[PDB]
Design a protein around this ligand. Structure first.
Ligand SMILES: Nc1ncnc2c1ncn2[C@@H]1O[C@H](COP(=O)(O)OP(=O)(O)O)[C@@H](O)[C@H]1O
Ligand SMILES: Nc1ncnc2c1ncn2[C@@H]1O[C@H](COP(=O)(O)OP(=O)(O)O)[C@@H](O)[C@H]1O
Lengths: 529, 177
């Protein structure tokens, strides 16, 4: 009757010899071992007990992983592994200083929202490497159930604990670092609870006594590192966001991205062919055209897709025809074909038509605004996204434009006595709706005066009904697109003054900027006389 | 294992490995009695059934196309001329143009017949789905799996049935949108 112990029970005690299991597991193991010795092989509970003891002994209970860090060395690792993220490194070094007084780990939980292709997942690896800390990743994008994170009922046959516990086993961790991908993209289902379970993951006091369905024990992890990723602020659940340590990451400028590609992406890519690193001929010139053709997107995702394929092509060829240092002329040969055209395809802008800036999940983008005549009464017809907030902002803009006209040029009654059609592209968040307020006005006055703007001028601003300008969100992301599209001048609200000066270096030089409080100012700027 | 057999021929893109593996792994977690298991199996079946990176061969000639055009229909001097222009341009590049092709005329003139003839000319697989009188975008994009009798996008369907990456699709009655 005890013959069944020799087969499996032997492996349990040997793995547990070093483990110092907590207070709750004192009585659990005693109960489990006693049952396993006396229950038959054909018993359902025997199989469950076998699986339970196998998991408990595999879990790093009480075997401490020695967290070692150095202030100066950690800083260097960040510099070495990644380019940019200046603010992020500072913030992370601030954490290191915090932990050093505390004489132990600190359970500050960070998140980086913003455009993709910034390297959120890779930054985490470097942080972990700098902190000599073990790392694992969750994808909340597909998180749908609590039974995913907390496991299934122990009683149920063939049950398995949650992802966090699976993480605990595999990495042999006591002080883990955790990544949480796409917090904003939480899945749904009949168990809509994982959204609120993320809240449980936030507070260290709820991380402590974190119940697992299979382990029949609350799991005590306190003061543990976590990193999260997102796209835009609004999409994150409010109760999570309010306590979460919200931090932004910026996009990449042309020359910034070029150096990144050469220095990091190419060597990582060159690894995947494995051919000799020196006398590589992926010079700036080759990459400059890759920028123009593929890299309309703010991040490096499309560049990475291209470059990785460039070196994959090289690998094949080691044994496929004479490459003869295959890796400007032969750009189209090696890749295939050009794709993208000039962004400003009507640099000679029609009257009634102006371009502005808007923000999107994928990154900052340039959006065009067109007005058209459809030919007492007079009306504006609005098209595009049919969201109510777009309509009301336009109505405001429409009326102010009329108001502006009646004092500036009382003789003209173009806008007053006509039906005008207006179109706006779909690439706008709710907050971007107001953001493109003045652009409409300009377009309307452009259509009314029948003259296009001072050439190559972009702009972003909400307009009051009496014409004063109001603050807008996402200045960082919007400015990138402006420089990308190669605008001469940007005019912004006075209250947005701080944000621009605080940006990266590269974007600042070669851009004319004026700060505005009232639209009267923009009128004179946009139209010389 | 059977999904792996399906994936053996129709290999998914490199970023889809994780999605496929994740679904298959959690299928192992879900009991075959659970509601989600049945839905999961459908999702995986639909995913694997798509001919990812798999396309039937295309052998073609402009002169042969004219012979097909002549034998299938009489007349349409201008129409034959117009369509051979696109065939010529497509042959030159060896790939599909950015610009797309549409035909207008009286009902029963043979607009759909031309489409069938072009497919036969190119030795190309053919499918047709109608957009005449539709008002719901969800008809195009399908519905999420939680819907009772979950049904995907029509475009996804036609790709699956044709068992190719490069099918000839007739999107009829675009005017009646
Ligand atoms: N600023 C940067 N410096 C160096 N490498 C970078 C930078 N930004 C991105 N990368 C590269 O991005 C890769 C990973 O990108 P990833 O984290 O998957 O993107 P995302 O943050 O959009 O999910 C890494 O291999 C890394 O080399
Ligand atoms: N010029 C033609 N020569 C031969 N058959 C024709 C011709 N025009 C139309 N047809 C016939 O029309 C039938 C179907 O027409 P269809 O494609 O439905 O027309 P439409 O697209 O205008 O509604 C086919 O059976 C085909 O034989």
């Amino acid at each position: 009757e005890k013959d069944d112990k020799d087969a499996i029970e032997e492996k349990f005690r040997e793995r547990l010899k070093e483990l110092v299991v907590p207070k709750h597991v004192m009585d659990v193991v005693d109960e489990e071992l006693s049952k396993l010795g006396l229950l038959d092989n054909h018993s359902s509970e025997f199989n469950v007990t076998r699986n339970y003891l196998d998991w408990l002994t595999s879990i790093p209970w009480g075997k401490y992983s020695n967290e070692n860090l150095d202030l100066a060395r950690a800083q260097a690792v960040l510099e070495e592994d990644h380019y940019g993220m200046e603010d992020v490194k500072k913030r992370i070094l601030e954490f290191i200083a915090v932990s050093q007084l505390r004489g132990s780990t600190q359970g500050k939980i960070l998140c980086f929202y913003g455009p993709p292709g910034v390297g959120k997942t890779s930054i985490a690896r470097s942080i972990a490497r700098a902190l000599n800390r073990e790392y694992f990743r969750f994808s909340v994008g597909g998180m749908t159930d609590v039974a995913e994170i907390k496991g299934h009922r122990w009683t149920y046959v063939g049950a398995m604990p949650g992802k966090i516990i699976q993480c605990l086993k595999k990495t042999k961790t006591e002080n883990p670092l955790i990544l949480i991908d796409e917090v904003d993209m939480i899945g749904r289902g009949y168990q809509g609870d994982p959204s609120s379970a993320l809240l449980e993951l936030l507070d260290p006091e709820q991380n402590a006594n974190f119940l697992d369905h299979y382990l029949d024990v609350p799991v005590d992890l306190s003061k543990v590192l976590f990193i999260c990723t997102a796209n835009v602020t609004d999409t994150i659940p409010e109760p999570l966001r309010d306590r979460m340590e919200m931090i932004n990451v910026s996009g990449y400028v042309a020359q910034e991205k070029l150096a990144i590609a050469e220095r990091y992406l190419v060597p990582q890519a060159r690894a995947l062919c494995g051919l000799d690193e020196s006398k590589a001929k992926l010079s700036s010139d080759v990459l400059t055209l890759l920028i123009k053709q593929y890299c309309r997107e703010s991040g490096v995702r499309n560049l990475q897709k291209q470059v990785e394929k460039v070196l994959r092509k090289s690998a094949y060829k080691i044994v496929s025809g004479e490459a003869e240092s295959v890796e400007p002329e032969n750009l189209q040969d090696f890749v295939g074909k050009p794709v993208f055209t000039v962004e400003r395809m009507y640099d000679v802008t029609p009257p009634g038509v102006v371009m502005g800036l808007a923000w999107t999940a994928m990154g900052g983008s340039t959006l065009f605004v067109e007005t058209s005549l459809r030919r007492k009464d007079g009306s504006l017809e609005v098209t595009g996204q049919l969201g109510e907030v777009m309509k009301e902002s336009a109505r405001i803009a429409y009326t102010f434009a009329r108001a502006f006209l009646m004092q500036h040029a009382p003789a003209n009654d173009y806008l007053v006595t006509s039906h005008i059609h207006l179109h706006v592209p779909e690439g706008a968040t709710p907050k971007d709706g107001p953001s493109a307020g003045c652009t409409i006005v300009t377009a309307l006055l452009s259509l009314a005066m029948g003259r296009p703007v001072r050439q190559n001028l972009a702009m972003t601003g909400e307009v009051s009904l009496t014409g004063k300008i109001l603050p807008v969100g996402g200045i960082k992301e919007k400015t990138i697109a402006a420089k990308r599209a190669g605008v001469t001048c940007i005019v912004l609200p006075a209250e947005n003054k701080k944000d621009f000066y605080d940006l990266a270096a590269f974007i600042t030089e070669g851009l004319e900027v004026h700060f505005v409080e009232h639209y009267r100012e923009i009128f004179d700027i946009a139209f010389p006389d």
